[PDB]
Amino acid sequence: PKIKTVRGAAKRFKKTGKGGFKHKHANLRHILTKKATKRKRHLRPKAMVSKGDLGLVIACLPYA
Amino acid sequence: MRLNTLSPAEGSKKAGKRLGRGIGSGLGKTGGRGHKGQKSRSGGGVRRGFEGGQMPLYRRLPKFGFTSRKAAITAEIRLSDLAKVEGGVVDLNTLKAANIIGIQIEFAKVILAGEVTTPVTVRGLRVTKGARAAIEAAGGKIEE
Amino acid sequence: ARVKRGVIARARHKKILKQAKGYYGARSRVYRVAFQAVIKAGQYAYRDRRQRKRQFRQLWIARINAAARQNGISYSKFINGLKKASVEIDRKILADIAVFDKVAFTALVEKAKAALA
Amino acid sequence: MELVLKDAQSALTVSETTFGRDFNEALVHQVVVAYAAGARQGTRAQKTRAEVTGSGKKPWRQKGTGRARSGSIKSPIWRSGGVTFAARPQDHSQKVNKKMYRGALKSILSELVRQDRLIVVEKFSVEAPKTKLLAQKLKDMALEDVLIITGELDENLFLAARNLHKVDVRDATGIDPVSLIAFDKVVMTADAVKQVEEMLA
RNA sequence: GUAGCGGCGAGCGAACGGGGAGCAGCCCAGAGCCUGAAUCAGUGUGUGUGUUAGUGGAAGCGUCUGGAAAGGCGCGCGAUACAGGGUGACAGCCCCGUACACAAAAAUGCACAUGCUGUGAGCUCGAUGAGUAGGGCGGGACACGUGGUAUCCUGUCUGAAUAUGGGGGGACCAUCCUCCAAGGCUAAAUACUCCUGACUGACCGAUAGUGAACCAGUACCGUGAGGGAAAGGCGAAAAGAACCCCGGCGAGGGGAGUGAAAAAGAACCUGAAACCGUGUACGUACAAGCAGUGGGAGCACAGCUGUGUGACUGCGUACCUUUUGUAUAAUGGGUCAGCGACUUAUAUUCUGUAGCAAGGUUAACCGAAUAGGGGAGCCGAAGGGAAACCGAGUCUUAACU
RNA sequence: UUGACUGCGAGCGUGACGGCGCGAGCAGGUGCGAAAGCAGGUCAUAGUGAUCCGGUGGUUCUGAAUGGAAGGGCCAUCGC
Numbered sequence A: 001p002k003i004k005t006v007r008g009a010a011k012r013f014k015k016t017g018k019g020g021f022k023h024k025h026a027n028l029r030h031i032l033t034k035k036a037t038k039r040k041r042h043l044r045p046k047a048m049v050s051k052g053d054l055g056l057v058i059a060c061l062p063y064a
Numbered sequence B: 001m002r003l004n005t006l007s008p009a010e011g012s013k014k015a016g017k018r019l020g021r022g023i024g025s026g027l028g029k030t031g032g033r034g035h036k037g038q039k040s041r042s043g044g045g046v047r048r049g050f051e052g053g054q055m056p057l058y059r060r061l062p063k064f065g066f067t068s069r070k071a072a073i074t075a076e077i078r079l080s081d082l083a084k085v086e087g088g089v090v091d092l093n094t095l096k097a098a099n100i101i102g103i104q105i106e107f108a109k110v111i112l113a114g115e116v117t118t119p120v121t122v123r124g125l126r127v128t129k130g131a132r133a134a135i136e137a138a139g140g141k142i143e144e
Numbered sequence C: 001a002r003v004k005r006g007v008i009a010r011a012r013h014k015k016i017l018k019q020a021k022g023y024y025g026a027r028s029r030v031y032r033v034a035f036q037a038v039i040k041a042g043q044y045a046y047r048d049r050r051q052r053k054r055q056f057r058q059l060w061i062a063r064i065n066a067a068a069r070q071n072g073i074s075y076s077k078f079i080n081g082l083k084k085a086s087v088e089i090d091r092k093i094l095a096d097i098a099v100f101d102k103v104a105f106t107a108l109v110e111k112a113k114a115a116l117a
Numbered sequence D: 001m002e003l004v005l006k007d008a009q010s011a012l013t014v015s016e017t018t019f020g021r022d023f024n025e026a027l028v029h030q031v032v033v034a035y036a037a038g039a040r041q042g043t044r045a046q047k048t049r050a051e052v053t054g055s056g057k058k059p060w061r062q063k064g065t066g067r068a069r070s071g072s073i074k075s076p077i078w079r080s081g082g083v084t085f086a087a088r089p090q091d092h093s094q095k096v097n098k099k100m101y102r103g104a105l106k107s108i109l110s111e112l113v114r115q116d117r118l119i120v121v122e123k124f125s126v127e128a129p130k131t132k133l134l135a136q137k138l139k140d141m142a143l144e145d146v147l148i149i150t151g152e153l154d155e156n157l158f159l160a161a162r163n164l165h166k167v168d169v170r171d172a173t174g175i176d177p178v179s180l181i182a183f184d185k186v187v188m189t190a191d192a193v194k195q196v197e198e199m200l201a
Numbered sequence E: 001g002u003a004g005c006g007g008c009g010a011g012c013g014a015a016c017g018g019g020g021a022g023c024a025g026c027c028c029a030g031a032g033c034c035u036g037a038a039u040c041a042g043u044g045u046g047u048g049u050g051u052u053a054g055u056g057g058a059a060g061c062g063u064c065u066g067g068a069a070a071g072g073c074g075c076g077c078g079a080u081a082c083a084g085g086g087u088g089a090c091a092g093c094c095c096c097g098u099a100c101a102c103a104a105a106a107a108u109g110c111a112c113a114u115g116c117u118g119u120g121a122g123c124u125c126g127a128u129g130a131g132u133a134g135g136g137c138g139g140g141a142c143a144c145g146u147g148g149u150a151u152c153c154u155g156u157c158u159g160a161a162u163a164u165g166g167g168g169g170g171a172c173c174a175u176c177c178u179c180c181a182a183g184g185c186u187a188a189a190u191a192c193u194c195c196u197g198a199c200u201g202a203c204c205g206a207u208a209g210u211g212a213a214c215c216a217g218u219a220c221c222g223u224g225a226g227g228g229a230a231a232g233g234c235g236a237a238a239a240g241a242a243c244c245c246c247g248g249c250g251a252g253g254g255g256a257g258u259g260a261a262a263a264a265g266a267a268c269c270u271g272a273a274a275c276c277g278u279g280u281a282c283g284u285a286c287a288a289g290c291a292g293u294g295g296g297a298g299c300a301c302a303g304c305u306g307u308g309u310g311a312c313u314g315c316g317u318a319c320c321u322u323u324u325g326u327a328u329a330a331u332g333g334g335u336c337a338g339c340g341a342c343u344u345a346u347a348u349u350c351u352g353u354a355g356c357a358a359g360g361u362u363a364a365c366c367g368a369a370u371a372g373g374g375g376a377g378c379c380g381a382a383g384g385g386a387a388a389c390c391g392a393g394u395c396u397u398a399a400c401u
Numbered sequence F: 001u002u003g004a005c006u007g008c009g010a011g012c013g014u015g016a017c018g019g020c021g022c023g024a025g026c027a028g029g030u031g032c033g034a035a036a037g038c039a040g041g042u043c044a045u046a047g048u049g050a051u052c053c054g055g056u057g058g059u060u061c062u063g064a065a066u067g068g069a070a071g072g073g074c075c076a077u078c079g080c
């Protein structure tokens, strides 16, 4: 049968042009008052998945 | 050229691994699985994403975004595709007839990709700035 | 495509058992035992090709020593003398001469003694 | 490109792409193998440990008896037990890209011409459906093991060839890669050549 | 494997829409008219055509080998028949068949034709499914776990409008579009094979293949439900050994005879190995241990070499597994023979290889077609952004060096 | 007095990763200083918690026939 996407991974990662994945940073859901603005501002933009993690992501998203 | 003088290309046919057929093979005994543990076992191995119990990457990161329904019924047209329609009038229906866009596409954008030599009349589609230049340069016209 | 193993299995066992001819008891009769015996026989043979070269040199030296001492000189001085004399005869030949041509052996000893004198 | 006829001693213009291309052995090999795979019926099975007849009773208790532990009389380790990886009926057919099929045919036909195994004739017919007649005709032409390709499948010729094991009679539409290679000589009617050209563009 | 659902975990997983196979529509909630008219149905009789027995069905001799010819060799012949089986070896022409052409007293299937009986079509004028829809409470089914949650079903309690009306379009309202619940029937394309016939297999070949090639669901086991074996092959033909002899009017054997062969003699083709013997050569009764290996005399034997043996002597603690590490006194194996463990399907990625190349490729299906048709689709040639959207750019930002 | 600013950030440190840290300089607007300047909290290194679900405010996003709305997204922030 067809491989099934890990649906939770598909809600967290999106494939980019050269075939990497973008994700949103952790640590910006709550407890925000104590965090420095600089810290928060740097968590806002989407980041790329790291080399060590790509294998895991790719396995979860066979149709990405 | 006989049934017993035909040969495959060199390198086209590699023999598969046969595990557990003796020392000489290099895959005898454990068959490449090493010694013991979950991964040596029949049916063994952990599921996709599992990292030994540490919160997996796809769970410690937040969900984001939503899926647009409008994106599913929107398409992009290359300049190179404008010549493939019939009649030289590029509209939504002529693009479908030419198998350029899917049947359920409602909106289409012509983008600057490839070249357009012939004059074409684009009607009803959106057109990028660069594509507008290319179409008008080729003698075409864009109708809104 | 079912494959029966009998014919090929028989041939392999027979090959091992032929190599185990002359061995004692199960070692020439029973495949499990014979296979171990034939492997071990192979391991020893490999080792013994090396040991054979050591055993013969040891024998040649002992014989040269006997003959040299009959001619009034030790092995160690004899060999030293021959080297100083630039004689390049090897121990196999010296030992051969010591046994078969004692007069020629005495000539070598004299040559050796002169080189030390 | 011209093909010399045997009977009329005329010429026949044919496409050089079809009848004059180089022999692509690797391509032809793939298509010949695929054709043979397509012939397989794939009908067989054995019984797994699930399918062998017998009960699920544990033969003897897990511990205490001094015997190897057993779970099922149907274990593949046991005489009369299941086959570890019991076969099921299989489909052995392979996909051959349309263009690779046609490419192979052109390689084969071109190679027959180079080896002088393709014989072109204006007509090939027998008067009555008599094996004797066809046998005589082929003996006159110095043929024996021959594939005959007509434009229209002459019923007389078909019936005359049935009992000759070395002879085969096809129509141009019904040619196949293996047949072309399998027979010593291929005789094509002028009509058939035209049809094969059109079939291979 | 999309949209969704989901301790948003594990997992579950549509529809719209497209391509195909197949295609069919009707009736009641009611009277008049029409008249027994469409039409199907029942029951006869015909005509074709299956099925249930069958009939005919071509063409070869010589010579060599052999126990035997169908084999070899030579020279012929048939073939709409060289499928297959049998026959003293592997036969187109010896036999049975096969291709092909014929066949039914009787019963019976199917398709048409046509008597008869029943049947009401068509037209006109009406009628248009209420404890129902909907609702509250509790559950269930829908991909959807009640969630913002539509729609469906209903155990419980209720309860409309009724064509100026009502349902649905994913909370809900308005607008628009679309359909008409609370009555029912309906072929085909689809599923399956206890069973019958025919044909096929890169399926098995007696520890395999059915549990069962054999008098097997038997023997046997169990109070019972139930469990459940082993076990095939003389020869072409029984020509299956008259008769004699030893023996207990034995068993068994030796002759004789049969046969191509009886070390084919019924405990029967072949007849491995473990295991057990008889004979011959050499060694062996002062000699210490994985039993070999290197060296090596002597003896025997066949043509100085080969073969067997091996006094004496250097070295030398099996194998597997598991381990930091095993001669280990850790594990496993009495031995032999047979069997016994990385497969298969689909999806996905990478490598090799082949085709075609800014394109590549078709799925189901059609097709007698491994052809050909079929481009529905799928992947690729554009990305950025959560998204609208923009687009060789785009996002971020009031704006970017 | 409110720089305990808003948008960013060359470059670098440190982590398997999730992350964590240092940062000149640029734009906008500010404070102190005559001015050069300094200020994106505190001499520095502890004072903390991912994701999911949910809440509040905002929003030139989305809005299942259409207009709305619900719901979703995005930005800010909160809770156990």
Ligand SMILES: [K+]
Pocket: B026
């Ligand atoms: K290898």
Ligand SMILES: [K+]
Pocket: B032, B033
């Ligand atoms: K491995």
Ligand SMILES: [K+]
Pocket: D080, E211
């Ligand atoms: K059995």
Ligand SMILES: [K+]
Pocket: D161, D162, D163, D164, D165, D166, D167, D168, D169
């Ligand atoms: K034939």
Ligand SMILES: [K+]
Pocket: none
């Ligand atoms: K003969």
Ligand SMILES: [K+]
Pocket: E089
């Ligand atoms: K034979």
Ligand SMILES: [K+]
Pocket: E091
């Ligand atoms: K025959």
Ligand SMILES: [K+]
Pocket: none
């Ligand atoms: K109700």
Ligand SMILES: [K+]
Pocket: D053, D054, E211
């Ligand atoms: K059984």
Ligand SMILES: [K+]
Pocket: E264, E269
């Ligand atoms: K025999």
Ligand SMILES: [K+]
Pocket: none
């Ligand atoms: K020894």
Ligand SMILES: [K+]
Pocket: E320, E321, E331, E332
């Ligand atoms: K072991």
Ligand SMILES: [K+]
Pocket: none
């Ligand atoms: K241990």
Ligand SMILES: [K+]
Pocket: E330
């Ligand atoms: K123990």
Ligand SMILES: [K+]
Pocket: D077, D078, D079, D080, E339, E340
């Ligand atoms: K077994």
Ligand SMILES: [K+]
Pocket: none
């Ligand atoms: K693969």
